[PDB]
Amino acid sequence: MRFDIKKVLELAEKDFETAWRETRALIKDKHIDNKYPRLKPVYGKPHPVMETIERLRQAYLRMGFEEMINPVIVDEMEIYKQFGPEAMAVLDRCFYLAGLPRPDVGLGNEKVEIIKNLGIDIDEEKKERLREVLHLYKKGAIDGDDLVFEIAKALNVSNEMGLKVLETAFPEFKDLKPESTTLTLRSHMTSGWFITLSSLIKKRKLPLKLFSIDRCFRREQREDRSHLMSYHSASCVVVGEDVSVDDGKVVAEGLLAQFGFTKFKFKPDEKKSKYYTPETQTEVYAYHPKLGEWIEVATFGVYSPIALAKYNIDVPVMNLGLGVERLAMIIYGYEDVRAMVYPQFYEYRLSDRDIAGMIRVDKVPILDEFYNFANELIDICIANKDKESPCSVEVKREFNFNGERRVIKVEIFENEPNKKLLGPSVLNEVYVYDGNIYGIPPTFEGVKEQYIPILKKAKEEGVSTNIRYIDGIIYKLVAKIEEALVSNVDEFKFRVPIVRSLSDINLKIDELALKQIMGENKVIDVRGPVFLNAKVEIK
Amino acid sequence: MRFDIKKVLELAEKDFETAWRETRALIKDKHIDNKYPRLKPVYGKPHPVMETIERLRQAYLRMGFEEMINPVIVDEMEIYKQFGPEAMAVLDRCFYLAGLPRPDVGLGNEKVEIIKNLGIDIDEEKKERLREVLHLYKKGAIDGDDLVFEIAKALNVSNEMGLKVLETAFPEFKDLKPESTTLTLRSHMTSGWFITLSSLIKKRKLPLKLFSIDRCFRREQREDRSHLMSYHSASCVVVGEDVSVDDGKVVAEGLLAQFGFTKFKFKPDEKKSKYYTPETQTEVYAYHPKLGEWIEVATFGVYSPIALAKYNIDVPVMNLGLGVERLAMIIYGYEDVRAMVYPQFYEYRLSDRDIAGMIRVDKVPILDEFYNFANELIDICIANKDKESPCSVEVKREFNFNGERRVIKVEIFENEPNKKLLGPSVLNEVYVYDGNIYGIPPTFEGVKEQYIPILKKAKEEGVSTNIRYIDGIIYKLVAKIEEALVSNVDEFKFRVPIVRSLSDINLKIDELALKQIMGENKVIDVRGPVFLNAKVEIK
Amino acid sequence: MRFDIKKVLELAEKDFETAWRETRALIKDKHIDNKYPRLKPVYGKPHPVMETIERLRQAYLRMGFEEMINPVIVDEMEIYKQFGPEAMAVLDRCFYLAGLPRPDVGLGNEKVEIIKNLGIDIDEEKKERLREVLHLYKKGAIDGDDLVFEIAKALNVSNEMGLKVLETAFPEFKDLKPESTTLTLRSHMTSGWFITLSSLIKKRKLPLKLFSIDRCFRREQREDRSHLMSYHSASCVVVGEDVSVDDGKVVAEGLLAQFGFTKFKFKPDEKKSKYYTPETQTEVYAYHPKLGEWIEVATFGVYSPIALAKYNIDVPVMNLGLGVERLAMIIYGYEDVRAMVYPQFYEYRLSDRDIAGMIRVDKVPILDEFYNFANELIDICIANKDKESPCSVEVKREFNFNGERRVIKVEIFENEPNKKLLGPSVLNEVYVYDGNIYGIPPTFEGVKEQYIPILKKAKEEGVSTNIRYIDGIIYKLVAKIEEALVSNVDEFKFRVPIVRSLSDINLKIDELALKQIMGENKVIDVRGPVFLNAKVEIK
Amino acid sequence: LDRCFYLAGLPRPDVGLGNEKVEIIKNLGIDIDEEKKERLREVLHLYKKG
C-alpha cells in the first residue's frame, strides 16, 4: 500500500518527534512464503562450454586473428589431398552423410515385374482412376510436409486425403537403407582450413592470421568415458612467407596466457601426421595452478608443402588446434566430459542454500486478517517461563468473519511442567548444514553443543531458513481458528505428531531435496514436544 | 633516434626563444612507404554469424534463460516419439551417420573360399612366417595412426615396415561402403530438447526456462541458393505448469526487441507440425527499419501432450526457434546466405580507402642519405614558373659514397616551354574515388573541373594517397643518382613513359586492385609529360 | 621464399619417392633472433578493475536490472535531504568544486584605487592607445585557448601579440584562490539515485529495478594504505510498492553468485545511517573459496520514508552497494589496492617465461650467406670427442664476398686435453628457473644433478631459451670471419672471457631482467672454458 | 585552468588556536535543551588526532 507524502512529511519540517524511528511500517514483509531463503533470484546461466567458446573466440580477436567459418562437410577426396596414403586409415573415424536413395525396384529392372502390386491397402480412395497428380519427385522436388492432397470450398470431404499409404503395406520401406555418399563430416578446422585457404591466398594480402572455433565430429562410436561424437575445436592458421613451429608455440602461449596459465611447455607428437611437415607436430600440455594433472589442451604443426601443394598453396602454413571441451573441464574443474557438455542428464545436487528455500510452511491462514493476527499472536507468546500452568493470557481479539462473527478468545499456556510457558526453545531457527536440517535455540546445553561451527549466524557455517518453532506452530493454530469459523467449531486443543521429524511446527518439504536428504543419509534433527493445545473458544 | 632531456629542456626554463615552434624535428616521418594510407591498421574481425550468435546468446541470458547444450546426434527412434506417424516424412531431410563396416567376406561365409588370396603384393616383407602381430581390431581397437610396425635400436632397417598393403591390391576397399546406422543428426534444438527435458524435469524445480544456440543439419542436398546443410538454431524452451503460445510471443518480442526490432507480428503456420499442439505453431515474421522485406526470423509452438507423454513429461512446454543466419542477414544486410556464412569464397571488393594504400612508389633511394636528399631536393623544386629555360639552380650537395665520392651537381629546369620550371601541376595529390584513380592540383581549369565532389579534401568525397607528382618524380631521380654511383655514370637525363597511365612519377600497384581497376572498367586519369631530364653530373 | 606447385607436386602423382619426408625445407627458421622464447605474442590486456566492472555491469543485466547513469556532481543541499541532521558530519568527506573567481579588486571597491598600476611590464605593445578589444569576459565568455591577438595578411609582424602579461607582474595571480561552490562530488550512487528517482517514479510504471556502476569520490585525503580518493560503486535500487531488506539480500546473492561465491551471509551495520530506515543497513561480507579473509564486498539498506519524502517519493526503495575495487582484489587476489588500480606504478616482475625471451645473442653474421654458413658449420662441429688434438676438419667452404674473395679454410678442434673435440658439453640449453639462469647438457654428473625438477623439458619445471653453447659460440666465430673480410685479416684464434657469467658463447641481456637477476640475488650458473680458438685462414 | 574544478572540504575558520587571545569569554553554551552528566569538558578529542 502506497503512503501519503505530507502525511509523513509533516512528522518532519519543524514538528520532528521520533519521526524517523517511527514510520518503520508502511512497508510490511510480504507474507512468509516469500521472505527468503524461500525467495530465490533468477538470472540467465551460461553453459560452461559455450562460455569457454565465447572466451576463446575473444581470446583470438585480441591477438588480431581474423574470425572465419570453415566448411563443416567435406568430400572424401579433400582428406586424401591433406593426408594422402594415410587418409585410408584416418577415415576410420569419419561419419558419412546419407539420405533417401532408390531401391532400384524399377525404371530399369521393371521389365518382368509390375503386374503384382496394384493397391496394397484397405481404405478409401476418393475420385476415380486419376493415376498420379503430384509428379513432384525428381522434377524440382517441392515437398517436405504432409497436407499432400486436400479440399477447400465444398461439402462432405474435410481436410484429409491419402494419409495412409504404409503400415499394412510397403514391407521394404521401414527397413529402407539410405545410400551413403562421398560427403563426410570432419575433424579439426584443418580439413576445412585448406579449402578455406586454397581459394583465399590469391584474394588477400599476406601475412595472414585466421581462426574459427566451431564443431567437429570425431567418430568414436559410443563413448561415455572418452569424449562424444562431436566436439568443439578452437583452431587457427597463420599464413606467412616466413613461419615455423615457433609461430605455433607463441600462439599457444598468447592463447593460454589469457586464462591464467603460466605453465604448459610443448613436446613432439609421436603420431607424426603426414599432413604436417616432419618434426613439427608438437603437443601442448597445460597445467593450471589447481587440479587437473598436466593435460593436453592443444596441438599444432606445419602443413607439409606437399599437402599445401595439392591445394595450390605456395606458402607454408602453421595450424594450432585446441580442444574447447578440454580446456573447458580444466577451467570449471570438471572430470566427466559428458557431465559437462550436458549439465542436466544426471546430477542436480541441491546446495544447503537451496534446501533452506525448500523448507516451506505447511498450513497458514488464508485470510490477511488472521494471517496478521498470527504474527501479532506470535510476538505475544514471547513471554514468561515455567509455572506448571496456568497464567492470565486469555482475553483476545474480536474481528469479524462474514457477519458479526467475532470474539475469539485464545488462551495460551503450557500445561505439562518443565516446559516453560511454551518450552525451553520455541525459538529454534531451523538451519541447514552439510545437507542436514538442524535448528537450535541461541541458548546452550553441553552434549551436542559441538555443532557450533555448524548452523548459527556470525562466523559459523550453515544456512538459515529464518523460521522459528513458534512461527510454524502459531501459524498452525491461527490456521485452525480460520478452518473452524467455517466448520462451526467452538473449542480446540489438538495433537497428532510423534517422534519422527520436523513435522508439526508446520514446515513441509518439496519432493526434491527430501529425495536427497534421505537419498544420501542426511539427518533431520529437530525434536519438539510442542502440543500447546492451548484452549481457544469463539464465544 | 631518442633525444636528450636538458638538451631540449634548456631551450625553456628562462631562456625561451622560439623553443616550442622549433624542435619540430627529433621526430621524422618514417620513410614514405609507411606513411598512410599505405599504413593500414590491424584488428581481429569477428564473423557476422558468430557475432550474431554471441549477441543472441547474450540476449537470452539477459532474459534469465539458462544456457544448455542439447545432444547433436539423436537416434531415429527419438524423432518417432516427437513427430510420430509424421516422422516417416520428415526423416526425408536427415543425415545418417556411418563408418567402417564389415563386407561379410569371412568369419561366417568363409567355408568354401580362403585358399585364393595369400599375398597380393610385390615388395618386401621382413622377418618370416609370423602370421599376425597386432590383433587390435575388435578387441579394444587401439589404433588411429600409422607407424604400425617399426624398429628401434639396431642397424639396417630404418623406421618403415608394411607401409604398402593397397594400390596394387584390395579391389573392393576403395569403393568400400560404410554401413549406415540408427544414429542421425538433427534439426532445431527440439529433437534435443525433449531428451534434455525428459531426464531433467524431475531433477529441477519449475518453472523452467532454457536456451541453446547451436548447430543443426537440415538435409537439402546441395543448395547454393537455399541455405546450406548446417545452420545455427537459437532455440529455447519454457517448462511451466501454466504456459501457452503467448509465452512464446513474449519471448520472440523480448528477443527481437534487443536488436532494434519494433515491427514483427505473428501468423499461424500451415505446416501444423504434429509434434506441436494444434493451432499453436505460429511463424514470427520480422521487418527491421531498413531493407529485407518482412522475413520470417522465428517460429514457435507448444509440445503436444502426446509427444511430451512419450518422453515422460507431465507438463506443457513452449518452444521458440530462431534462425541465426536468418537474422544474421537482416542485421548486416546480406542477400546471399553463402556469401555470408563463408565471407571469403567469392567477393573481396577493395574500397577506395584500400586502393590508396595500394598505390605504392616504384623506385626510391635505398640509402638513408640519398633518401633524405630527395625530400630536401623536392622542397627545392617548389619554385618559379615558365621561362623556356634556363635558370640558376645547379650547385648542389656533395656527400660521400664509399670513399671521397661526392660533388653531385644536380641542375633542375624545364627546357620545353609552356611547362613552367617543372610544369603547371607537379603537385597532383593522386586521389581515389568510386574505384578510380585521379589526382589533380588545387588550381583550376574549366572543362573537367566537375570532379569537385570527387577527390580533394574538406567536404569532397574521395580518399587521397598523400603523394604529389614531384614526389615520385624526384624519388625517381635521386634513385638514379644512387643507381649511378655504383654503375660509374657521369651524366643523366632520361625518358621512357608515353600516354598510358600513372607510370612515371613512380608509383606502381599491387596485383589486386589493379585486377579490379581494369576488371570493373575503372579509369586511371593522371596524364603527365614530366620528362624533367634535368642534367646532373657527379664531378 | 615461395615455392612452385608442380615443382613439388610432381614428387607425388605417380612418381612418389620420399616426397613428404623430403621437401622439409622451403620453410626455413626466420633467423635466431626471432625463434621464441625471443618471439613473444601480443594481445590487448584488460585492466582488472575495468574488467570486473564489465562483469558486474553484465551481472546486473542478466538479473533484469536497468542500466542508468546518475549525476556525479550534486549540490550540498541534496545531501541534507538524504542524510539530514547527520549530513553535517558526512560532508566531512566530500570534495567541493571550484574555479576562477573574482578577487574583488574593483568594479565595486574601485573608488580610491586605480591610478597605481598602468602597465607593469617591460616589452612591446603594438599599435597605440586602443584600450581593450576582447570584451569576452562575463559577456558570453568565448575563450579557452591562446592565439589571443594575431596577424594575417601583411608584413613584419608574425603570429605573436601579447603572449606576456605575467611573470614579472601580477603578484596576486599565481596564488589566486578559486572560490568554492555549493556543488560537491559524491559517494555511492545513492546521492544520485534519489535525484534520478525523484523525477522518474511518476514517469515509469512500477515495480522498478535500476543499476549504475560508476565512479565516486570518498574524501580521505592522501591514502596509500586505505583506498584512494575515487572508487567505483556498483550500486542499484529497487522501487517496489512492497519491498524490504530481503529484496536486498537476494540481490547481493544473485550478484555474488555470478562470480563463484557461495559463502557470504549478512550482518547488521552499526553505523545505522539515518538515510536508511532503522535496522536495515546490513553489511555483506564475502569469502570466496581462496585467500582474502571474510571481507565486506557490499552493504545495503532501505531508504527511510522521511528521506524519500523530501524527494517526493511515495514508495520504499531498497539500495545495495558494492565496492568494485573491493571485489576486484578478491577476484585477482590483490592485496595493495593501489598496486591494482594502477598496475604499473611500482612492480613489474619478469616471469621466467620472459627472461628466456630476453637472453638474446651478442654478435651474429650480418650476411645471410655467412649466417647460413654458421648453422651449417654448427651441425658439423657435432662430432668426435677427446684426442688432445688434432684431427682432419680443415677444408671448408669458399663463397664470394665483394669480388672473388673466397677460400675460407676453417679448422675446428680443441687443443687443450680432457675437453673432447670441443668440450664435455657445448650442448647446454641455458634454461631459466626461479629467476635464475642455468643450462646443463642432457648428460649426468652427480654433485649438482639435483636441479632435475629445475630446467630440462618433459616433466621438469623451468623455461628454455632454445640456445646451446656451440650456437652462440659458432655465431661468434662466423661473425668474426665476416668482421675480418672487411678488416683485411688472414688468421684468427682469440680469447677474452674469464670466470664471470654466460658472456662468451655470445648471448647478452636486456637492461631489465638483468636489473632483476642481480637486484634479487639470482644466480647465473653457466661456466664455460670454451676458447675454441680454432685456426681459420682466408687463403 | 579556466575550465577546471578544484576540490575542497571542511576547513578552519581561524576563529581560535591562534587569534584566541582577546575572545573566548563570550560563547559558553548557545543552546536551550538537556546536557546529561556534569562539567566533563570534552570527551571525543578525535579531531586532528587521527
Curated annotation (Swiss-Prot), chain D:
Belongs to the class-II aminoacyl-tRNA synthetase family. O-phosphoseryl-tRNA(Cys) synthetase subfamily. This is O-phosphoserine--tRNA(Cys) ligase. It comes from the Archaea. Homotetramer. Interacts with SepCysS. The lineage of its organism: Archaea, Methanobacteriati, Methanobacteriota, Methanomada group, Methanococci. It comes from Methanocaldococcus jannaschii (strain ATCC 43067 / DSM 2661 / JAL-1 / JCM 10045 / NBRC 100440) (Methanococcus jannaschii). The chain holds residues 91 to 140 of 539 of the full protein. Catalyzes the attachment of O-phosphoserine (Sep) to tRNA(Cys).
